[PDB]
Design a protein around this ligand. Structure first.
Ligand SMILES: Nc1nc2c(ncn2[C@@H]2O[C@H](COP(=O)(O)OP(=O)(O)OP(=O)(O)O)[C@@H](O)[C@H]2O)c(=O)[nH]1
Ligand SMILES: Nc1nc2c(ncn2[C@@H]2O[C@H](COP(=O)(O)OP(=O)(O)OP(=O)(O)O)[C@@H](O)[C@H]2O)c(=O)[nH]1
Ligand SMILES: Nc1nc2c(ncn2[C@@H]2O[C@H](COP(=O)(O)OP(=O)(O)O)[C@@H](O)[C@H]2O)c(=O)[nH]1
Ligand SMILES: [Mg+2]
Ligand SMILES: [Mg+2]
Lengths: 107, 258, 436, 430, 53, 436
């Protein structure tokens, strides 16, 4: 039996832990708290993330944004048709008029 | 190695001696026996020295250049793969390389792109992609005749319905930043367009399917940007950066107008 | 945003052969020249435009010129696996070596090779439209890298004048040294490396050796491992031009925020995490400790000790899983700690930068695939310690007129020696006086 | 009727503007497609203040984006509520100032500002009766600070009557990004004290402090800092757009807060803002809004107000409220903390109420307090500026462009006498 | 009993009332970080087993 | 909160390796690094954070640094079962020993290893954020345990100072002994152990041999069994940091409640019940008798009889099913009994601590699964007996200047011999005066 941090209170009563308050008052990080109490924190705050189709791409904050299609809105950037390399700079709108690759779909 | 994915690496392609291929064609079933019985009975344990000796005994033959060619080709083949470089990874790979005269054989090449009279088909990482000529280039599609008049009046209802189809609560604008508008499937988009514009001719509908199937992201099944798809369909133009090797000349040199 | 990269010397184009292999991998370009079959109809990124140019039918010919005098290493490039990647004209190559002889490379063979070199670069800049700057690659040990290197930088500065020329140079290490006349070459080169380079970045070899010995635990490292991680540093400070980030810095920012006086441009680079695949398995990667790891002298790219010096300014390129939240927290802890100290005249001595794309691995490389990384480019007075360390062993050999007959025979005189020596003396006085 | 032309300068200007136009668009019920979708009629009558009806229910914002780098514009156009701006209003250069105020004020500004002046003038006479211009920018970068500052001076010379708000973030040493932050902030502030009508000093230091202590978020990206500043801007102009029992326009607030023409630097806050763990345990009353509004750890500046005196203060409330409760709370706050308020101005608190809350909230508030604790910020910047300028650090990057030494001397002297006039008004008596 | 007849300002995570204009729901606070870190761990384990092999 | 433990010497890392086996078993850590959630019934929590750090990818590395000069025993760790648990980078191993020599270990070799050690510990302390304190494990008999063990403690007091440095040392036994130069080693170590250790706890080996002979009745023990029950002591005095109980006592209280003067920190220790698997079933374990049994000299960890001394203060850690009522009753009857006596000027000579979690067993160890246990740490004048007995046989050997040429050849002189002798003399005067 692994020992918990705060097992029982002064009375003989088991302790149900509040992970949200911990995540608020930074007594532990939220990324750690959810994994450590995956049962309550999923009921308390947490839900699963959307994954990219290709697992070779690293999974980071911006990759999760571009996965669940909130990339351009939440994060200042440009959405890309490709998904293997999402953060490729695309400047179709800002390209000068006489550029050799410039379409006028937006204008 | 032959079962590897096969990449576009440039080749060396020594010129082969003339009477060599027709003699290897009937000699190699014996050279495979010789190399194996010299290597101890199992494949993938043949040294290039043992292979050269088995070749020299199986084909007595072997004028100077005809032997030097085999020796040089075997040397290149053994260095192809990073590692120990003490044995041969694949005897069939070596045989094919010796027949073709190319360090990397014809069998390890790419799949290519089929170009029937109108269409252009590319087998890609995720499925196949197709482009139909006589009605498009890479950048500009040929808009149907009576479509824009009917689309520009009921333009916005199309997306209102397209989001309602995928579950957008149109009262609050929270869902747009939530990202439900981001994910829209192609048949759902065309069904919303049908429900908005009524009867959609097969030609105009195919135009819509083509443009949406372009704008959809690779991998996932849903489009990237709906309000951008709006101006896309309106303008009849696409941000495709159509590439070079075999599609770019075939569009603009061939006569696809009539 | 577009930047062209010229390589001067046998060390320059071996670095370039590692850098361009990394760039083709970061943009998915197959070594024969063009993107795979997936991206033929719709394509994608459009990020490559700052290094490659989409030519003809499915080809991306990079924006660089390898130039050397012996045809050995250049023809090795011409016959390697990147036969198709580089346009034949760009890979310049002379006929005979400068042979560790600054005078030979600056007065004898330069006069016929540099005109062809800069008449190529001119048509590269004309194909360009929004040229950010040039970036040069040279080792000041040899003759080609130093001799016509100095001649090229001079004629580039007379043709363009104010354009930013990032100079990633390689000095001779103090103890690990491969030549004898390299002090003469280094001193005569630095008199023009001072005056024509906009921002110079020092890269000594024994520092990178200790990195591979200690961190990556490669017990027997060859030059390809060094050039690999040098390419990683170049990639990490240009990724802001290539991929979009939350807080971007271009080439113009380095000139702005790291050069407090036009004669002080010598940057001790660094990088973190330089971790093998097993130590990565044991050690966690968070922004706080890799920011700390980028500051210790056991992870810098130049064998010098900043504890003897005072930081003038600092630049920090972050890549990958990085939020401005914790990088502000980390630089906070750094500025409150006192184990390192800044110059009084700079009170806000940092400049951060964040990019989204994490660094890549190269198959055959030994670094592990990480989610985040940091590349520091600082400025201090440890550099002023380096020049005097080199100045002393130049004055040793020059006191007995050793090897002088070679240079005087090739076309120079001894006034160049005296003037290059007193220049280093003046630059030493400059560094001591700024650090006060 | 009364109109607000929006101006966004630089990267920070554009990203704040993007979240701002998202917030306003949700308040008025217009979708990413630029058409009306809302339910109440009360949303339609006052979208002339921000939009222009184009064709069949198509409203394009009255904004002018201006910067020097393509990445910022694409971040604008690519996001949702990005395809609603007019492409003509995207005046835009592509060299890049790069943290260089001189570049943003003499080389690139001097030739790009005329095209910006075309777009802003064209959009200024596109409406009937200007209420004022609303410029949102930063004081750290160059393309925001330098070009924005020249834009302010040119606009104030063309249209001197109309109002002029400027939301400017000031570089703080605690979260200090670049190195030449003081060289840009000092020169910019000197121009702001002579051209802008009123300024609202933000800073990322207090914004981060809020998201940590009060909101208690885990990953406060720049999206939320823009979220906060945008909510402040919306709260400022709620009174123009919605009917209230006591209205307060921009010019009404300015005349109630600015006692002297040079003294127009405000500190701002917002209410309510509570963590999601603590939103279960709270109530929604006017006292519950005031206790968080006047809280020193809820200001959006890094100046503790109890280090000085509140010269004037203002509060804009939204929701079904009782004016007696509003005025009694302001009176109680003024009477308890009777030392932090200036003596020679009785009844230092202007107040106003509007009946339309934000979508989903029951009641909200917005605070604008013109204090004399703002000279804490300017002294904190000026000490770094004089630290470098005693030693001509980084000075060549400006001097080699057209700037001289006298510009720095006068900029420091203007900063010096401003904090001197704030000290004297803090130590004045009756 | 206005206090007793009134709903809390935010009820949980998914709430139809709470749009972007109302400041009760912030995107920056993410409840998915916990599982995102798990995904990171899986990626790293796979990558480094491959590299070691 | 975090506490990181350093180990100096061949006994240091053997003790360290029994402790870390016990810790991994207590928090359910498989030796390859991760914990299987299925197998451990206990509820999950972040209690482990004070020893293990969540590193890499689902991995826990201890906050520890073994350091030794011989590569033998350290490389033996690197080949053992816990290969993947530790870093390869935290086990610091020299190349040549100190070889039973304070001099060789303090002047010659320490000056090379101490810089690498404490400039690694800075990176562990940087990873921590709520660091409680360091705790050192060492035997003073050896060379590296004494010499650079004192050099480490000295530079720790300089670098950090105010962070608590708990010391668990191993003194040579009076009659059972393994070395000859150990008096010189122990004396020259304890002069610095005075003014640099915060709280020191003595541990003698013949005392523990007595325990395993009498109580656990293992007639042929090894060092492992000694290491095992010493780890029981360490685990039971950090259990309050790890698992919260009814009345917790952190690492900052021993300093407060047991150190009445800054130069008096030497603590007898004990443990009860130390009971095999067969006396466990028969004997009924209750709080009264285990509080009694932890007080006789037949159950202490130091060979000394406090009946000759006066208890200056005491500290009682309890684990398991202990209510505050009966522990208060037991400490009451001890206070009333006159077989032991407390110093007059200290009336309230106790500090109790209570933790719910019972002490775990090591399958294959000799202890049985126990309901409740006591770990006492007291302070007395019997320690004044130990140092004086040791001082007698140091001057015995020093009278003929035996072995001195070893130290003088290493770089010492005779002054520190004299001042370390009289320093123990002053301390003896201190303990004899405080006991008054
Ligand atoms: N960092 C690094 N330095 C290299 C590498 N290869 C060669 N060098 C350096 O090159 C210096 C000598 O000059 P080289 O590049 O070999 O030859 P060169 O500069 O072209 O001069 P010449 O021999 O006259 O042609 C030595 O100091 C080496 O340190 C490399 O792969 N990496
Ligand atoms: N209590 C206890 N003491 C030990 C143990 N192992 C070694 N010792 C003691 O260690 C003391 C000598 O130091 P060592 O650890 O053997 O050797 P060292 O500390 O590395 O010093 P050098 O041999 O000079 O390098 C002796 O008095 C032993 O009694 C152990 O497992 N338990
Ligand atoms: N609140 C906020 N501050 C920002 C943002 N982006 C940058 N900053 C701050 O602005 C300063 C640099 O501004 P900068 O981007 O150079 O301004 P610009 O380039 O002229 O648009 C830094 O100190 C940042 O902390 C943003 O999106 N929001
Ligand atoms: Mg060379
Ligand atoms: Mg030993």
């Amino acid at each position: 039996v692994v020992g918990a941090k705060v097992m029982k209170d002064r009375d003989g009563r088991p302790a149900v832990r509040d992970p949200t308050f911990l995540a608020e008052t930074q007594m532990m990080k939220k990324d750690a708290a959810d994994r450590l109490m995956g049962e309550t924190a999923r009921q308390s705050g947490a839900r699963d993330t959307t994954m990219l189709p290709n697992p070779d791409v690293p999974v980071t904050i911006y990759t999760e944004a571009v996965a669940n299609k909130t990339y351009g809105g939440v994060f200042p950037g440009t959405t890309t048709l490709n998904t293997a390399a999402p953060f490729g700079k695309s400047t179709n709108f800002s390209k000068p008029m006489s550029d050799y690759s410039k379409v006028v779909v937006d204008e | 190695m032959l079962n590897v994915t096969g990449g576009r690496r440039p080749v060396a392609s020594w010129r082969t001696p003339p009477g060599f291929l027709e003699r290897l064609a009937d000699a190699w079933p014996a050279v495979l026996d010789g190399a194996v019985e010299q290597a101890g009975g199992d494949p993938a344990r043949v040294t290039r020295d043992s292979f050269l000796a088995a070749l020299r005994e199986a084909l007595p033959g072997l004028s100077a250049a005809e032997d030097d060619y085999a020796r040089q080709v075997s040397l290149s083949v053994i260095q192809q793969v990073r590692g120990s470089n003490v044995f041969f990874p694949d005897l069939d790979y070596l045989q094919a390389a010796l027949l073709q005269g190319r360090v990397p054989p014809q069998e390890l090449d790419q799949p290519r792109s089929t170009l029937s009279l109108a269409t252009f088909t590319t087998t890609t990482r995720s499925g196949t992609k197709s482009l139909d000529l006589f009605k498009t280039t890479g950048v500009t599609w040929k808009i149907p005749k009576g479509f824009l008049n009917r689309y520009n009046d009921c333009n916005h209802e199309v997306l209102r319905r397209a989001a309602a189809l995928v579950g957008a609560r149109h009262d609050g604008a929270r869902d747009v930043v939530a990202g439900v508008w981001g994910r829209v499937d192609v048949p759902t988009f065309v069904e919303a367009c049908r429900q908005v514009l009524g009867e959609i001719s097969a030609d105009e509908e195919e135009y819509l399917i083509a443009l949406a199937s372009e704008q959809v992201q690779d991998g996932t099944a849903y489009i990237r940007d709906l309000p951008f798809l709006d101006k896309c369909i309106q303008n009849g133009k696409t941000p495709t950066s159509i590439k070079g090797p075999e599609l770019l000349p075939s569009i603009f040199l061939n006569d696809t107008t009539s | 945003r577009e930047v062209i990269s010229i390589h001067i010397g046998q060390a320059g184009i071996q670095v370039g052969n590692a850098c361009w292999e990394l760039y083709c991998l970061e943009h998915g370009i197959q070594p024969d020249g063009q993107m795979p079959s997936d991206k033929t109809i719709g394509g994608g990124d459009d990020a490559f435009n700052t290094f490659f140019s989409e030519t003809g039918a499915g080809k991306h010919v990079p924006r660089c010129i390898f130039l050397d005098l012996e045809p050995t290493v250049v023809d090795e490039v011409r016959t390697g696996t990147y036969r198709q990647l580089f346009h034949p004209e760009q890979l310049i190559s002379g006929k005979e070596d400068a042979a560790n002889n600054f005078a030979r490379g600056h007065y004898t063979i330069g006069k016929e090779i540099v005109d062809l070199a800069l008449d190529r670069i001119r048509k590269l800049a004309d194909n360009c439209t929004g040229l950010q700057g040039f970036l040069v690659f040279n080792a000041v040990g040899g003759g080609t890298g130093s001799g016509l290197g100095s001649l090229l930088l001079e004629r580039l500065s007379v043709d363009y004048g104010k354009k930013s020329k990032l100079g990633f140079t390689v000095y001779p290490s103090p103890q690990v040294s491969t030549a004898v006349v390299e002090p003469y070459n280094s001193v005569l080169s630095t008199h023009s490396l001072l005056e024509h380079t906009d921002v110079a970045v020092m890269l000594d070899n024994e520092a990178i050796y200790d990195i591979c010995r200690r961190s990556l635990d490669i017990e027997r490292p060859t030059y390809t491992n060094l050039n690999r991680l040098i390419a990683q540093v170049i990639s990490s400070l240009t990724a802001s031009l290539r991929f979009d980030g939350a807080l971007n810095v271009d080439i113009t920012e380095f000139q702005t925020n790291l050069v407090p006086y036009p004669r002080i441009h010598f940057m001790l680079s660094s990088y973190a995490p330089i971790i093998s695949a097993e130590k990565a398995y044991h050690e966690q990667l968070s922004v706080a400790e890799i920011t700390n790891a980028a500051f210790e002298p056991a992870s810098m790219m130049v064998k010098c000790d900043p504890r003897h010096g005072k930081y003038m300014a600092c630049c920090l390129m972050y890549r990958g899983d990085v939020v401005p939240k914790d990088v502000n927290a980390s630089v906070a802890t750094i500025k409150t700690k006192r184990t390192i100290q800044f110059v009084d005249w700079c009170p806000t001595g940092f400049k951060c930068g964040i990019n989204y794309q994490p660094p890549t691995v190269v198959p055959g490389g030994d670094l592990a695939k990480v989610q985040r990384a940091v590349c520091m480019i600082s400025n201090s007075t440890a550099i002023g310690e380096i020049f005097s360390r080199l100045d002393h062993k130049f004055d040793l050999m020059y006191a007995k007129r050793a090897f002088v007959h070679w240079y005087v025979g090739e076309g120079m005189e001894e006034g160049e020696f005296s003037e290059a020596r007193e220049d280093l003396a003046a630059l030493e006085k400059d560094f001591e006086e700024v650090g006060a | 009727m009364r109109e607000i032309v929006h101006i966004q300068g630089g990267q920070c200007g554009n990203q704040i503007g993007a979240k701002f136009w998202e917030v306003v668009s949700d308040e008025h019920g217009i979708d990413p497609t630029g058409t009306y979708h809302g339910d109440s009629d009360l949303q339609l009558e006052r979208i002339n203040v921000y939009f222009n009806e184009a064709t069949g229910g198509r409203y394009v914002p009255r904004a002018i984006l201006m910067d020097l780098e393509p990445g910022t514009m694409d971040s604008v156009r690519s996001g949702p509520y990005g395809q609603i701006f007019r492409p003509d209003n995207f005046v835009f250069g592509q060299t890049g100032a790069g943290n260089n105020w001189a570049k943003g004020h003499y080389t690139e500004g001097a030739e790009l500002i005329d095209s910006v002046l075309d777009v802003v003038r064209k959009e200024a006479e596109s409406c009937d009766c200007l209420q004022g211009f609303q410029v949102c920018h930063s004081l750290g970068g160059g393309t925001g600070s330098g070009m924005g500052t020249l834009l302010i001076s040119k606009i104030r010379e063309e249209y001197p009557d109309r109002m002029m708000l400027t939301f400017s973030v000031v570089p703080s040493p605690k979260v200090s990004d670049t190195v030449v932050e003081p060289y840009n902030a000092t020169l910019s502030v000197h121009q702001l004290v002579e051209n802008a009508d009123e300024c609202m000093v933000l800073d990322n230091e207090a914004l981060y402090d809020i998201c940590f202590r009060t909101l208690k978020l885990t990953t406060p990206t720049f999206g939320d800092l823009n979220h906060l500043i945008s909510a402040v801007m919306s709260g400022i102009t709620c009174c123009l757009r919605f009917p209230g029992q006591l209205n307060a326009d921009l010019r009404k607030l300015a005349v109630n807060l600015i006692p002297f023409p040079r003294l127009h630097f405000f500190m701002v806050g917002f209410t309510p803002l509570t963590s999601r763990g603590s939103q279960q345990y709270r109530a929604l009353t006017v006292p519950e809004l005031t206790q968080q509004m006047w809280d020193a750890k809820n200001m959006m500046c890094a100046a503790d107000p109890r280090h000085g005196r509140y010269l004037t203060a203002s509060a804009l409330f939204r929701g079904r409220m009782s004016t007696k409760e509003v005025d009694e709370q302001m009176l109680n706050v003024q009477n308890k903390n009777s030392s932090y308020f200036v003596e020679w101005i009785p009844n230092n608190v202007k107040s106003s109420v509007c009946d339309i809350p934000p979508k989903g909230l029951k009641m909200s508030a917005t605070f604008i307090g013109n204090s004399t604790a703002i000279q804490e910020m300017f002294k904190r910047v000026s000490e770094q500026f004089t630290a470098m300028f005693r030693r001509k650090a980084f000075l060549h990057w400006y001097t080699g462009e057209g700037m001289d030494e006298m510009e720095f001397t006068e900029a420091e002297s203007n900063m010096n006498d401003l904090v001197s006039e704030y000290q004297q008004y803090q130590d004045a008596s009756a | 009993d206005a206090k007793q007849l009134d709903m809390p300002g935010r009820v949980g995570d998914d709430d139809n009332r709470l749009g972007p204009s109302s400041l009760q729901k912030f995107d920056g606070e993410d409840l998915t970080a916990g599982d995102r870190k798990k995904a990171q761990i899986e990626q790293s384990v796979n990558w480094w087993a491959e590299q070691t092999a």
